[PDB]
Design a protein around this ligand. Structure first.
Ligand SMILES: Cc1cc2nc3c(=O)[nH]c(=O)nc-3n(C[C@H](O)[C@H](O)[C@H](O)COP(=O)(O)O)c2cc1C
Ligand SMILES: Cc1cc2nc3c(=O)[nH]c(=O)nc-3n(C[C@H](O)[C@H](O)[C@H](O)COP(=O)(O)O)c2cc1C
Lengths: 123, 134
């Protein structure tokens, strides 16, 4: 009895969607513990390991920019992009985002659902 | 020597539900611990079935309670059927029969074939003035 996907919840009211919650599948597949990711953005998953300072070149710029647009416009998203576990191994992430609307027609949260998929790998 | 996974579960802010969009009538293949804790129903009891049982007042009412709004329920059927998102607020009930106010979001997952393979349901059980009590 275990989830088929990663779940992530961000606070859409604070700036830049800080993570307030990740599920155990997120933790187990990416190798990052909740306690090291809370209060920050998920884009760290696009840098190869905890110490790369730049978005890795094999993650699709075009897809990343679609995420920005969708978040900006308060609409849902789905796409595939390269991520990396804490140990730097690559990881393919079939990601879906959906916003949660509060009373005032303002967004309180975004939900992230990650369907992880692995690869042939290099490096 | 590892750090355990799942230390902050107690802080999960919402229920999560996953259904199989391919089998008939959206059978549940996963629910999270919040769902379990808030609704009072354990996974073993709900897996394999449709989520609609929550509109019945407790486990012994066979049908949806007269007070849940059929228009919202209709909007849900529509969104599931058309393959699109849904958000709305829906009267539900715990296993003990107390009212829950469910701020439900549904979002479909498209697989390889550009085919919906799952639906995700997210439940923010929210503060409500609704009370049916003694
Ligand atoms: C709820 C939520 C979950 C997200 N989950 C992931 C994820 O699992 N992997 C990933 O690479 N990006 C994820 N993102 C995307 C990044 O947070 C970010 O929004 C994206 O990289 C675009 O912003 P940027 O160009 O400023 O980096 C998620 C975003 C949100 C709001
Ligand atoms: C992923 C998913 C999650 C759902 N979660 C709930 C829920 O938490 N509470 C609820 O009353 N209905 C939920 N539903 C809705 C019912 O399963 C059903 O689709 C709805 O009652 C409309 O169909 P019906 O009129 O045949 O019962 C969910 C549906 C899906 C697909």
């Amino acid at each position: 009895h275990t989830a088929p996907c990663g779940f992530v919840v961000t606070d859409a009211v604070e700036p830049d969607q800080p993570i307030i919650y990740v599920n155990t599948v997120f933790e187990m597949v990416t190798g990052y513990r909740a306690e090291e990711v809370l209060g920050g953005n998920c884009r760290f998953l696009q840098c190869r390991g905890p110490f790369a300072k730049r978005r890795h070149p094999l993650v699709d710029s075009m897809v990343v920019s679609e995420i920005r647009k969708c978040i900006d416009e308060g609409i849902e998203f789905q796409g595939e992009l390269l991520n990396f576990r804490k140990d730097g191994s690559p990881l393919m992430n079939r990601l879906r985002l959906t916003p949660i609307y509060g009373d005032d027609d303002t967004i309180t949260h975004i939900i992230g659902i990650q369907f992880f998929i692995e690869t042939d790998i290099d490096l």
